[PDB]
Amino acid sequence: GMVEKPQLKFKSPIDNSESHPFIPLLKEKPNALKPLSESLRLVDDDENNPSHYPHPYEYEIDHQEYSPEILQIREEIPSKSWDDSVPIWVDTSTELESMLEDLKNTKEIAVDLEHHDYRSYYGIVCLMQISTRERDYLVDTLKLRENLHILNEVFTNPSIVKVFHGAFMDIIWLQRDLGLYVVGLFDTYHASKAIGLPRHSLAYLLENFANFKTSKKYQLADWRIRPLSKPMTAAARADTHFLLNIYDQLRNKLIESNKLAGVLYESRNVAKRRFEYSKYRPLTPSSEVYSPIEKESPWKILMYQYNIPPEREVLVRELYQWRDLIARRDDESPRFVMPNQLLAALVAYTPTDVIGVVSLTNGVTEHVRQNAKLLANLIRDALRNIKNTN
Numbered sequence: 354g355m356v357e358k359p360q361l362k363f364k365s366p367i368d369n370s371e372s373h374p375f376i377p378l379l380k381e382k383p384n385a386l387k388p389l390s391e392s393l394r395l396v397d398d399d400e401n402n403p404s405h406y407p408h409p410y411e412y413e414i415d416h417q418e419y420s421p422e423i424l425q426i427r428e429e430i431p432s433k434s435w436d437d438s439v440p441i442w443v444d445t446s447t448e449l450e451s452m453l454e455d456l457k458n459t460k461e462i463a464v465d466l467e468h469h470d471y472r473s474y475y476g477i478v479c480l481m482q483i484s485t486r487e488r489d490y491l492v493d494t495l496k497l498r499e500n501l502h503i504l505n506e507v508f509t510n511p512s513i514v515k516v517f518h519g520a521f522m523d524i525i526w527l528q529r530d531l532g533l534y535v536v537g538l539f540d541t542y543h544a545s546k547a548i549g550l551p552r553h554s555l556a557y558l559l560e561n562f563a564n565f566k567t568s569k570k571y572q573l574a575d576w577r578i579r580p581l582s583k584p585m586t587a588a589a590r591a592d593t594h595f596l597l598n599i600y601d602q603l604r605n606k607l608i609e610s611n612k613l614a615g616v617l618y619e620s621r622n623v624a625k626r627r628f629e630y631s632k633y634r635p636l637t638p639s640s641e642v643y644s645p646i647e648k649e650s651p652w653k654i655l656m657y658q659y660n661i662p663p664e665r666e667v668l669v670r671e672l673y674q675w676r677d678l679i680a681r682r683d684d685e686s687p688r689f690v691m692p693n694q695l696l697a698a699l700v701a702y703t704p705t706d707v708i709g710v711v712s713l714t715n716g717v718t719e720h721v722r723q724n725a726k727l728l729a730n731l732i733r734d735a736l737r738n739i740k741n742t743n
């Protein structure tokens with residue numbers, strides 16, 4: 354189908370202006386050790402990062418102690434029979450409240466998310482998966498975007514472990530879109546490594562500790578679609594349904610070899626990661642701060658050198674910033690607006706009129722089509738400031 358952009362229905366309009374450092378959406382702060390007060394402030398300019406807001410839970414992450422039974426070798430609890438229950442779909446404030454209530458009675462929960470980045474500028478969280486020892490929940494993060502902040506009561510309670518596999522981006526996506534933070538994280542990815550298993554992916558873990566062959570076919574899927582296809586629903590459910598058992602086995606092995614503290618330390622840092630707009634990204638890019646990364650050709654003249662002539666660097670760069678503003682304007686992803694191959698094609702063939710732009714051998718996107726004149730004008734200008742100068 355056409356899949357009506359779900360953003361259009363958000364209670365708060367998206368902003369790609371990037372006119373200010375990223376601000377946490379967190380209006381409340383449970384399981385607090387340091388009042389939300391201090392949190393919302395700033396960290397005025399320095400040589401390692403311009404003004405920015407800090408991670409609203411950085412403190413508690415460092416200062417709050419872990420759940421006792423995490424340091425003990427406990428008997429592993431098998432995942433529950435896939436067929437004994439159906440995944441609970443959550444898309445109402447009521448459906449959401451009963452789950453929260455239910456989540457508060459746990460010692461630990463497994464969590465995962467599905468994200469979309471083709472019809473959005475920064476990207477958006479379309480689905481969230483949460484598993485307890487008894488059931489699997491499927492949360493529509495699109496429809497409950499403005500409500501999911503109440504989950505903090507559980508996600509920040511150090512007395513409930515939260516299991517994620519390689520949550521380095523989940524932590525980011527969670528704050529950026531839902532204002533959710535995580536205190537008491539256990540990353541099965543960092544655990545796999547410490548133990549030294551042949552591979553460290555979730556797929557690997559599922560096949561060897563839960564006999565479940567996974568599918569990469571849904572990491573290109575459009576998680577915006579409603580309802581979700583059975584095969585899609587199953588894949589999402591499979592991401593947290595077996596994680597708590599896998600968690601038990603890894604935690605125990607980590608304990609048995611004196612490597613837990615190391616894994617917990619690694620997890621605390623993944624949880625501490627902060628989301629900041631590219632504009633205000635730290636000078637020295639690291640794993641403590643995450644700034645939007647471009648999924649395509651080098652910033653200017655692409656390295657993919659489709660045999661990109663000398664002078665055409667300016668043309669190329671004008672096309673880039675143009676595509677970015679357009680993407681930021683209609684809140685789309687750069688490749689949707691115009692994929693590099695096309696950017697290249699334009700630069701490579703330098704069409705000077707609308708015909709030339711829309712009949713461009715490779716093919717054309719809607720944005721390129723709906724802006725063919727501006728693009729022909731821009732291209733024609735390049736070809737001219739090239740003939741002039743020298």
Ligand SMILES: O=c1ccn([C@@H]2O[C@H](COP(=O)(O)O)[C@@H](O)[C@H]2O)c(=O)[nH]1
Nearest residue numbers: 465466467468469470571572573576592
């Ligand atoms: O090769 C990949 C793997 C994952 N993802 C993104 O990560 C989300 C969660 O993937 P995972 O952490 O469950 O593997 C996906 O829904 C998708 O947005 C990708 O874009 N490409």
Ligand SMILES: [Mn+2]
Nearest residue numbers: 465466518523
């Ligand atoms: Mn994931």
Ligand SMILES: [Zn+2]
Nearest residue numbers: 465466589592
């Ligand atoms: Zn997943």
